[PDB]
Coordinates of C-alpha atoms in Angstrom, one line a residue:
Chain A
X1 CA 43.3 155.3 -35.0
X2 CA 44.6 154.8 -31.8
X3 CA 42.7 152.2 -29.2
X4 CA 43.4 151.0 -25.8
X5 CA 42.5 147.4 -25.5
X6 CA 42.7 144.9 -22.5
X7 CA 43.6 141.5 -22.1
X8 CA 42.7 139.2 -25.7
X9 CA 44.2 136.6 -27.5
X10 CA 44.9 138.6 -31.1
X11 CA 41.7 136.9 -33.2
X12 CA 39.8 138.6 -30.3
X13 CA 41.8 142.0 -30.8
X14 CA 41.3 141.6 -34.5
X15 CA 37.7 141.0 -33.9
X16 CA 37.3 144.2 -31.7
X17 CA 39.6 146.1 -34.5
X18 CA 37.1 145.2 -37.4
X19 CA 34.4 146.2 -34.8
X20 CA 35.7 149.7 -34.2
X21 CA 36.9 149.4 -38.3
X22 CA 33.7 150.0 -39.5
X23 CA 32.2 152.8 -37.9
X24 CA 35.9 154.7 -37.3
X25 CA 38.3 155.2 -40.6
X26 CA 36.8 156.3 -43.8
X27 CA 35.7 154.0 -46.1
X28 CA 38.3 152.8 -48.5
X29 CA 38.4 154.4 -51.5
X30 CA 40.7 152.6 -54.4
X31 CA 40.5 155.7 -56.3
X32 CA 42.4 157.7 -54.4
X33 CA 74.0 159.0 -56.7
X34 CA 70.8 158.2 -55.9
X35 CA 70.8 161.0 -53.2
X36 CA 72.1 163.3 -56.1
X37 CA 68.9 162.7 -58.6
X38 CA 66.9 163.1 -55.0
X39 CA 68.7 166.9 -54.8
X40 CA 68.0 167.1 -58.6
X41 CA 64.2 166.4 -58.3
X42 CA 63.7 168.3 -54.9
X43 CA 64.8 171.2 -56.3
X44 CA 62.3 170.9 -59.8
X45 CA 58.8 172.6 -60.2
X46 CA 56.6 171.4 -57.1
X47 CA 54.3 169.8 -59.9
X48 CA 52.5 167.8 -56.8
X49 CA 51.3 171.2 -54.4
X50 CA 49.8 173.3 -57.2
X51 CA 47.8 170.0 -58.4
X52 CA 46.6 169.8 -54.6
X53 CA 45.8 173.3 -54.5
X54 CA 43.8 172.8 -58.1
X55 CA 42.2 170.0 -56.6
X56 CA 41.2 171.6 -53.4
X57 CA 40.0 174.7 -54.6
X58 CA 37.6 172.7 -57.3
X59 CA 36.2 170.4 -54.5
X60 CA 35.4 173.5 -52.6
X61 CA 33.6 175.0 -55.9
X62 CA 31.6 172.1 -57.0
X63 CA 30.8 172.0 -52.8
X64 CA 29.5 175.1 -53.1
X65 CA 27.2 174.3 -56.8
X66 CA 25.8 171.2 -54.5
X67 CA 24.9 173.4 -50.8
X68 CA 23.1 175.9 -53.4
X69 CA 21.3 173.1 -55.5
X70 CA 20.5 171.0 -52.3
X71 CA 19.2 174.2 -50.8
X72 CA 17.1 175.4 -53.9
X73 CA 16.0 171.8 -54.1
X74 CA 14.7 172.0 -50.0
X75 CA 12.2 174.8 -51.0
X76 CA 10.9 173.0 -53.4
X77 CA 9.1 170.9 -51.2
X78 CA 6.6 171.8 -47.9
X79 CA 4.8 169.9 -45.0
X80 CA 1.3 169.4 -45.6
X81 CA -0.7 165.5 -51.2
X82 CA 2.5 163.6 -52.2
X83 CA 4.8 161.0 -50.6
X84 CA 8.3 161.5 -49.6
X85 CA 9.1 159.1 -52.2
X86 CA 7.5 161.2 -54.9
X87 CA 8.7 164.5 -53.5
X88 CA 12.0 163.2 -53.2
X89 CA 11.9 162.6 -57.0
X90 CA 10.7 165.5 -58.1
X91 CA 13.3 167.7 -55.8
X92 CA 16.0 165.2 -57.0
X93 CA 16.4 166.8 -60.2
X94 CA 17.0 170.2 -59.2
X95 CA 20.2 168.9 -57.6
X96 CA 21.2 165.6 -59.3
X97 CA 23.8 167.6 -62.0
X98 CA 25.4 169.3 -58.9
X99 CA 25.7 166.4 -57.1
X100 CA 26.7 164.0 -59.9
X101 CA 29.5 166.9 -60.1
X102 CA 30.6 166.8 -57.3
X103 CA 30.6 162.9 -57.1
X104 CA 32.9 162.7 -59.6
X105 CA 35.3 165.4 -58.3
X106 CA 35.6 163.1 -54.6
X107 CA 35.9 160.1 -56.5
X108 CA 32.8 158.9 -54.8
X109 CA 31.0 157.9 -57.7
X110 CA 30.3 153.5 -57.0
X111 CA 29.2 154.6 -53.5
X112 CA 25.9 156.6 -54.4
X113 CA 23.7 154.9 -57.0
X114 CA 20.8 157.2 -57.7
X115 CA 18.4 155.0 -55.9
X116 CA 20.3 155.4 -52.7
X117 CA 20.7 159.0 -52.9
X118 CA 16.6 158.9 -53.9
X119 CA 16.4 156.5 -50.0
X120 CA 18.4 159.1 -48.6
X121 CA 16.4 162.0 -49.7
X122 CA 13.1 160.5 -48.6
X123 CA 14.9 159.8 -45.6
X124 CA 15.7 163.6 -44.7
X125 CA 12.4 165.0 -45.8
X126 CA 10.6 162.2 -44.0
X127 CA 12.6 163.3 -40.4
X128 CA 12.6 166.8 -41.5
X129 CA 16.5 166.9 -42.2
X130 CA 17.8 170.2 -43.3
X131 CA 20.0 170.3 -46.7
X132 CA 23.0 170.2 -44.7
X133 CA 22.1 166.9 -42.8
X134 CA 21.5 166.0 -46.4
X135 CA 24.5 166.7 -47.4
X136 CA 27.1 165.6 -44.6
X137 CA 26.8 162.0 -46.1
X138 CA 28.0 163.2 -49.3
X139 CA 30.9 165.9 -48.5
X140 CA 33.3 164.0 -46.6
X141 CA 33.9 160.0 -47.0
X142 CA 32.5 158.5 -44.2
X143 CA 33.0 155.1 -43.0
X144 CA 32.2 152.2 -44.1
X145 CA 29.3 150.9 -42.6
X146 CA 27.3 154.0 -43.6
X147 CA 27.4 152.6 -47.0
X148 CA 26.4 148.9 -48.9
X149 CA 26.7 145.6 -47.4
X150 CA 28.1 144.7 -50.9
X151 CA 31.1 146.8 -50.0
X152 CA 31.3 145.6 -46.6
X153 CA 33.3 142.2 -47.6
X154 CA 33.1 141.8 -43.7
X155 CA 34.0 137.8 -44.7
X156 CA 36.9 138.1 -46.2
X157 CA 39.1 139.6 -43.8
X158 CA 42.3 137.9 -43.1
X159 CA 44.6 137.5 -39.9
X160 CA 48.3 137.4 -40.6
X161 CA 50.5 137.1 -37.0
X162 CA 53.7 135.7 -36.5
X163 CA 52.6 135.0 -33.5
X164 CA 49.9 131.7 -33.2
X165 CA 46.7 134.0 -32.5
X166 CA 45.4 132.2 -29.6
X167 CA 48.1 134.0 -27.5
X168 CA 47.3 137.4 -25.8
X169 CA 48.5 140.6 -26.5
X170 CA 52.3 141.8 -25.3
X171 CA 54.7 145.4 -26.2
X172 CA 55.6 144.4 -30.0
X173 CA 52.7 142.5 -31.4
X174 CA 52.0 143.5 -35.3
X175 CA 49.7 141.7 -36.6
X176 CA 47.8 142.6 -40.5
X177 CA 44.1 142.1 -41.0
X178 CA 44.4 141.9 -44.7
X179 CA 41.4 142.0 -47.6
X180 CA 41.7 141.7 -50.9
X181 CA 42.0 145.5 -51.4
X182 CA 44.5 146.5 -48.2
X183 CA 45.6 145.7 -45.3
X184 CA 45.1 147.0 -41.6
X185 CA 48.7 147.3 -39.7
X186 CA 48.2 147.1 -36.2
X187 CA 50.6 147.4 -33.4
X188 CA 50.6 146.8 -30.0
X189 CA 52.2 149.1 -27.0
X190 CA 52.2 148.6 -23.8
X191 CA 50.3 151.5 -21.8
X192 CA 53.2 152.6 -19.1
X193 CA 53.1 152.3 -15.8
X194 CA 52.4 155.7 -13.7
X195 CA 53.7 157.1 -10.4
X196 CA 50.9 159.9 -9.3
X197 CA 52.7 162.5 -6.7
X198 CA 50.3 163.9 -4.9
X199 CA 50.8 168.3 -4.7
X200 CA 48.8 170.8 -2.2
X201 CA 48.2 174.3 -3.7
X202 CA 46.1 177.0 -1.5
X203 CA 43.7 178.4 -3.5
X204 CA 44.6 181.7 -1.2
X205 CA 48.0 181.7 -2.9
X206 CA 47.3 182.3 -6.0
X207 CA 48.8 186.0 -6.1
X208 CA 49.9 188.6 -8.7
X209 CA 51.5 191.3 -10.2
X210 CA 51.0 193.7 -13.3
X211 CA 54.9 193.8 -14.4
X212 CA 55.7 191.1 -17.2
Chain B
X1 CA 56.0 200.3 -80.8
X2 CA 54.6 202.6 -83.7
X3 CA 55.7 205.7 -85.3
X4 CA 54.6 208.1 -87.7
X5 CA 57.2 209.2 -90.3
X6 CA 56.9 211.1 -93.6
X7 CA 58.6 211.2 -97.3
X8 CA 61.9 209.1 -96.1
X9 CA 64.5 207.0 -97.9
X10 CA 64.8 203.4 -95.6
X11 CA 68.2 204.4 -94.3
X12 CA 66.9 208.1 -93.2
X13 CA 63.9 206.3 -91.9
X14 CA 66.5 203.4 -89.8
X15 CA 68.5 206.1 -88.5
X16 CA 65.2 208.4 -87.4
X17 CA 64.0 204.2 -85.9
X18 CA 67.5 203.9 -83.9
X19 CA 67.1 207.2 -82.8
X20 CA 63.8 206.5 -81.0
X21 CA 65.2 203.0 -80.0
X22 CA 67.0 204.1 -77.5
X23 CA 64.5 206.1 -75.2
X24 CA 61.6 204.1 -76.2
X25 CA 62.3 200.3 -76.3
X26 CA 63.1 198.7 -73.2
X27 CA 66.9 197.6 -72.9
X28 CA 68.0 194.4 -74.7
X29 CA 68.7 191.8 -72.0
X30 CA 69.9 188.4 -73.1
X31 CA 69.1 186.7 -69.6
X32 CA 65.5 186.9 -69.8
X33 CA 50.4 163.1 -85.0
X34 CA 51.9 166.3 -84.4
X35 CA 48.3 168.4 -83.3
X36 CA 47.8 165.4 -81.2
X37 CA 50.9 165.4 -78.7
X38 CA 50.0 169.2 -78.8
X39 CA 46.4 168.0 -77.3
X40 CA 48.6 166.1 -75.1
X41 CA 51.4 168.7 -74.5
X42 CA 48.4 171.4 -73.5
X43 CA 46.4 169.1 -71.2
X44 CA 49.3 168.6 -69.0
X45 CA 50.5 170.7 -65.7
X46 CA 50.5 174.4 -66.6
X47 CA 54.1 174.6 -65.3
X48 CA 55.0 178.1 -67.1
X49 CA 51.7 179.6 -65.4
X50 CA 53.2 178.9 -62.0
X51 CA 56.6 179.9 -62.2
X52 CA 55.7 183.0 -63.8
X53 CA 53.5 183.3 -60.7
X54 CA 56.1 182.5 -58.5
X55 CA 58.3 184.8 -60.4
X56 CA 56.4 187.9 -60.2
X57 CA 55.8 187.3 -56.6
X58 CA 59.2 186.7 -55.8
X59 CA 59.6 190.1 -58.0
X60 CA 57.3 191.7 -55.9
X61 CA 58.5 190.8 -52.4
X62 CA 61.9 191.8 -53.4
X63 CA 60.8 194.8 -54.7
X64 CA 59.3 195.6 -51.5
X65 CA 62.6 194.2 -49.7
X66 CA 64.0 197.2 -51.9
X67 CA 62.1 200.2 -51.2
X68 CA 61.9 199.6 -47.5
X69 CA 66.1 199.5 -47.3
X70 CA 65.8 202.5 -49.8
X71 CA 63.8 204.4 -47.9
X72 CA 65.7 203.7 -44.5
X73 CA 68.6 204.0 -46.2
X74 CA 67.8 208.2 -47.2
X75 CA 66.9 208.5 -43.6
X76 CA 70.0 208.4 -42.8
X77 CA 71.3 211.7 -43.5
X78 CA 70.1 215.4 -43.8
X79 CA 70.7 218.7 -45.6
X80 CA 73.1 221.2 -44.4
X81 CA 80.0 218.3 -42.9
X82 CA 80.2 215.3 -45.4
X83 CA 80.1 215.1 -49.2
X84 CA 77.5 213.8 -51.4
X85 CA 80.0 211.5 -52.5
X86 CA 80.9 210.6 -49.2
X87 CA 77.4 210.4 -47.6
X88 CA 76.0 208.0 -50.7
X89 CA 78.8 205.9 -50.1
X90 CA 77.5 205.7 -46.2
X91 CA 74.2 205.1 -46.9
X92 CA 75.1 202.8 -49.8
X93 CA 75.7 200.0 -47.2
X94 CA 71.9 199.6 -45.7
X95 CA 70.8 198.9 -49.0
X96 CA 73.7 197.6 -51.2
X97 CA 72.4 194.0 -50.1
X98 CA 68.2 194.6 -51.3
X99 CA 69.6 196.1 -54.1
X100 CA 71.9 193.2 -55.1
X101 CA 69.1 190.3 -54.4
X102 CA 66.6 192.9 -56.6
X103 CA 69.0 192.6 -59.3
X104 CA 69.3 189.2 -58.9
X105 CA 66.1 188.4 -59.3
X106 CA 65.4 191.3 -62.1
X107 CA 68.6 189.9 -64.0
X108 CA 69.8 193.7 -64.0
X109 CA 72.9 192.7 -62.9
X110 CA 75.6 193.6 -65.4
X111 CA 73.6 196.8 -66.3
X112 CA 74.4 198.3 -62.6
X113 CA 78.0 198.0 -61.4
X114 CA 78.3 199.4 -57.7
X115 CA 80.2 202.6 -58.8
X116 CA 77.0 203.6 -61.0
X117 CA 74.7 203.1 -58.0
X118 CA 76.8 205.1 -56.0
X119 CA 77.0 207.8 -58.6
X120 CA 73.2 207.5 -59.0
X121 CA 72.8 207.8 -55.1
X122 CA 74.7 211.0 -55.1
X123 CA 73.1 212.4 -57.8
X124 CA 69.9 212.1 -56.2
X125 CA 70.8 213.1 -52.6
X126 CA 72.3 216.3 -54.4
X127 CA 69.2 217.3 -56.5
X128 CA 67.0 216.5 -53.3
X129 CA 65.2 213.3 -54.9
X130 CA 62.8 210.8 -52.7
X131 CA 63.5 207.3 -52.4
X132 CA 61.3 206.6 -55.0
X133 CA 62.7 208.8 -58.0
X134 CA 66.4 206.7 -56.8
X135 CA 64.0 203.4 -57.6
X136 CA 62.7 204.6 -60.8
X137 CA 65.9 203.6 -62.5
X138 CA 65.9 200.0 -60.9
X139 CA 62.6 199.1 -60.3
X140 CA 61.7 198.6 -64.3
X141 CA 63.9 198.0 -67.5
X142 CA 64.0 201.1 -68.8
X143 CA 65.9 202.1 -72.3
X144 CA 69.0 201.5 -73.7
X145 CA 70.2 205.2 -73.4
X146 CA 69.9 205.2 -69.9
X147 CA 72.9 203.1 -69.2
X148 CA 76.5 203.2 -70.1
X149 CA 78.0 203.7 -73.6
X150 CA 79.5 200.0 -73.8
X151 CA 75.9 198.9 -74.3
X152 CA 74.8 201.0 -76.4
X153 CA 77.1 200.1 -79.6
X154 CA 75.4 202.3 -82.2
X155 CA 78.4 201.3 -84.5
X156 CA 77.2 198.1 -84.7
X157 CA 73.6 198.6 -86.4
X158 CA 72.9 196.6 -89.6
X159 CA 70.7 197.6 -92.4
X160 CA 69.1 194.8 -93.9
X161 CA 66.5 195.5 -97.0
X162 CA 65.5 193.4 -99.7
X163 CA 64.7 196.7 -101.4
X164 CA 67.8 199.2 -102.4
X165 CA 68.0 201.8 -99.3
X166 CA 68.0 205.0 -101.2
X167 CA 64.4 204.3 -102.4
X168 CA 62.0 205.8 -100.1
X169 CA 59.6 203.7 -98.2
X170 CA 56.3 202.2 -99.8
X171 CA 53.1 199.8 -97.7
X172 CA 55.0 196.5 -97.1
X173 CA 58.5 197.8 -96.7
X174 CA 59.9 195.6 -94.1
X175 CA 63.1 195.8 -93.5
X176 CA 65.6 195.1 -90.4
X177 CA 68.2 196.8 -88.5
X178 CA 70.1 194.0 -86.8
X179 CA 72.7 194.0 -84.5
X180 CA 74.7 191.2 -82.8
X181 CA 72.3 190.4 -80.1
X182 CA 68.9 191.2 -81.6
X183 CA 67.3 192.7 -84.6
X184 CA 64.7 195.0 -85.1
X185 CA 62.1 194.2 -87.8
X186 CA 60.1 197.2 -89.2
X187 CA 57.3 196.9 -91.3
X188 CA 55.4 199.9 -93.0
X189 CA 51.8 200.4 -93.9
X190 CA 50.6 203.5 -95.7
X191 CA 48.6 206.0 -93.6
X192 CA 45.1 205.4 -94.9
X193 CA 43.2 208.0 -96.8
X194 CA 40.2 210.0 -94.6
X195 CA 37.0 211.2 -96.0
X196 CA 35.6 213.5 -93.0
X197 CA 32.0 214.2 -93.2
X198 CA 30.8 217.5 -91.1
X199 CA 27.5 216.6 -88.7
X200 CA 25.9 219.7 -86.6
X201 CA 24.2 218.8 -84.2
X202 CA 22.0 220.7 -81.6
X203 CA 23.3 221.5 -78.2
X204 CA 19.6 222.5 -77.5
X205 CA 18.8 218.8 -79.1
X206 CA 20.5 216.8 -76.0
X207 CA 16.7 216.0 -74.1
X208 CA 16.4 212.8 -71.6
X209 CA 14.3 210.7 -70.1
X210 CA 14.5 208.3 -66.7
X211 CA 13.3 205.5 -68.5
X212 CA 16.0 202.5 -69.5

């Protein structure tokens, strides 16, 4: 992501970073001569795009088993007695196969304990959430503040600058704010300086013609 | 492919088989702990599926490539001065390069020299044949007859029985005609004995319903 930022010292940059960190990239998910043998493999079976195309086209299909089982599990379930706790138990096993499916085909399995997916369905059918606004926490990613504060690790981040980090920002600065699982690369531009011209167009000549 | 064939001694029978070799087989062409690493072998990247895929499409888009110069290619002349020899080697020229990457990618190279597609284009602009009837001969194999007497080598054929060839054939006579690129293995089953058994039925008798 790009950012424009003003003037900081870098540990207030890296604080405003892990700010807009949270809520803006997807969560991270760990579960996701010479020039001659480079000629040699270039030119072998493209193992790596038909394995992307298998791997896209079963995402799309077990996407499709969970909008159908999340739908059929919606109209189980009316207004009106029963709580949204224990309709959003009994609705939960008309779509917990399809969803464990497709879980497991994202490689979004530690994210989703049952329990939270059980929160989350109480949660639509309490503010009357369609099975799509169900579902738009599950298709894609999503951040990482949408999810547990166990996965947060919002302590542990690390500020690695070559530059002593009281200093402000300047064209060049990289700095890393590292965890234990990656790292977040961030460099610094400056943001040019501009010369506006100022141009008068008459709205009366604005004329044309039908050839070309 | 199958035959029927009567009261035969096995070399009457492998002359009466190379007879019908070459108009019905295709045309030989010579360019085209252990059950556990099979397990492994067969769960890996289906690699043969895709090039085959590629293959056929490739085929297919050549193909196309082919009959679009082909058919361009005959509208460029007209009954009536200019020889059929003469006007197939003039419109030889907007299609001698489809035709070359369709052989290419066919492997039908060596079978087609240019002086037999030229001799095949005027024999079909002199007995009035579309486009399509000149393709016939490239688009597909076809048999070894079709093509020029240096492939043929009928001198070549080898009898090879375990049983004495004068003695006519019995069930599980298998025997082989080889040749110095291939061989063809024969096997013979007896024709199986019928007992037909006569049934009249009714044309009266065929009665309906709308049920099921």
């Amino acid at each position: 992501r790009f950012y424009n930022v003003g003037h900081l010292s870098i540990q207030r940059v890296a604080v405003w970073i892990l700010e807009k960190y949270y809520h803006d990239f997807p969560v991270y998910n760990p579960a996701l001569v010479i020039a001659a043998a480079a000629r040699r493999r270039d030119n072998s079976h493209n193992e790596y795009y038909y394995e992307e195309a298998e791997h896209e086209r079963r995402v799309r299909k077990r996407r499709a088993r969970l909008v159908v089982a999340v739908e059929e599990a919606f109209t189980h379930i009316k207004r009106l007695v029963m709580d949204p706790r224990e309709a959003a138990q009994a609705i939960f096993a008309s779509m917990a196969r399809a969803m464990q499916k497709y879980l497991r085909t994202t490689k979004q399995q530690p994210y989703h304990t049952m329990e939270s997916i059980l929160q989350h369905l109480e949660f639509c059918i309490t503010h009357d959430m369609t099975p799509k606004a169900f579902l738009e926490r599950y298709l894609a990613a999503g951040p990482t503040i949408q999810y547990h504060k166990e996965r947060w690790l919002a302590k542990q981040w690390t500020l690695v600058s070559e530059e002593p980090v009281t200093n402000g920002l300047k064209d060049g600065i990289v700095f890393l704010l590292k965890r234990q699982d990656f790292s977040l690369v961030v460099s610094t531009k400056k943001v040019p300086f501009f010369k506006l011209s100022e141009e008068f167009v008459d709205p009366k000549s604005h004329k044309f013609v039908m050839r070309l």
